[PDB]
Ligand binder design. Sequence first.
Ligand SMILES: O=C1CCC(=O)N(O)C/C=C/CCNC(=O)CCC(=O)N(O)CCCCCNC(=O)CCC(=O)N(O)CCCCCN1
Ligand SMILES: [Fe+3]
Ligand code: NA
Ligand code: NA
Ligand SMILES: [Zn+2]
Ligand SMILES: [Zn+2]
Ligand SMILES: [Zn+2]
Ligand SMILES: [Zn+2]
Length: 279
Amino acid sequence: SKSLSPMPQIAGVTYYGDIPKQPKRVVSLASTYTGYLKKLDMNLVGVTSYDKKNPILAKTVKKAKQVAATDLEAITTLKPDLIVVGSTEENIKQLAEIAPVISIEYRKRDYLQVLSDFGRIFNKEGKAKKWLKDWKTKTAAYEKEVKAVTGDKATFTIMGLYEKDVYLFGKDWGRGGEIIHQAFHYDAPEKVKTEVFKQGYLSLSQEVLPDYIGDYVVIAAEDDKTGSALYESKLWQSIPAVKKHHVIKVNANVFYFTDPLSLEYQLETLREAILSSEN
Ligand SMILES: O=C1CCC(=O)N(O)C/C=C/CCNC(=O)CCC(=O)N(O)CCCCCNC(=O)CCC(=O)N(O)CCCCCN1
Ligand SMILES: [Fe+3]
Ligand code: NA
Ligand code: NA
Ligand SMILES: [Zn+2]
Ligand SMILES: [Zn+2]
Ligand SMILES: [Zn+2]
Ligand SMILES: [Zn+2]
């Protein structure tokens, strides 16, 4: 049998079976976590559709098969020694019959803690610590670069276009919020702090958008055509941030994510976009 993880008790983490310390064949069924596992040098043999559509992550998991959580046959034949899932997955019991499962309830640990937590689970503390120390220094330095341009108290709102809907996001639901609010310590407008932050996200009617945007807005979308009718509208064009050219449009295919690999890309992209807003 496998050498075992110490399986620490961590908020949000549930273990099904004996988790290996050094898994050799991991199936990741939760896009939140795939890039954390890659950062810690795990061999991923299965990943999700969102993972494959994230160009930053996809480059690192070319040999992994795309699978869904219902793919019991394909997952079995991948011969995993570990499966990682989100806690809301429909069929964790069936997955745990195939291999040991780590199930994570989102948001119980923050985007940085998740990495050091995996460091404890897999005895990869050094790799996690090195990344986290560098991240702390780099983000503080970049925070200075961007606030030099905007002012330290400029407000930012995180937004996404999805289907025909409009979402706002807080500090810990992807779409750039970790970078903008946690890494750069930008404030959000009061209405976003009150109505969005605790909730994580808020699906909004388009006509009230002006009320939620202050100095800057970051907008994630999967395709560059989705926002067209909104963007040309008098409503949108009346927003001071829009008039100032403080709209930052980003590609959701990577910006949905919160993992170290995706966030490295988001960090550089957002730094450059803020600087570019004053070109
Ligand atoms: O984990 C993150 C950031 C936070 C996040 O989006 N999560 O889903 C984490 C798990 C949240 C707890 C379970 N909640 C839900 O499943 C509710 C639906 C959901 O995924 N949400 O994010 C809620 C707001 C978005 C709803 C519309 N769906 C999308 O934007 C698809 C991309 C979308 O939201 N996805 O999750 C697929 C890509 C995600 C890449 C990893 N990103
Ligand atoms: Fe989500
Ligand atoms: Na933080
Ligand atoms: Na999608
Ligand atoms: Zn700060
Ligand atoms: Zn039109
Ligand atoms: Zn203009
Ligand atoms: Zn400006």
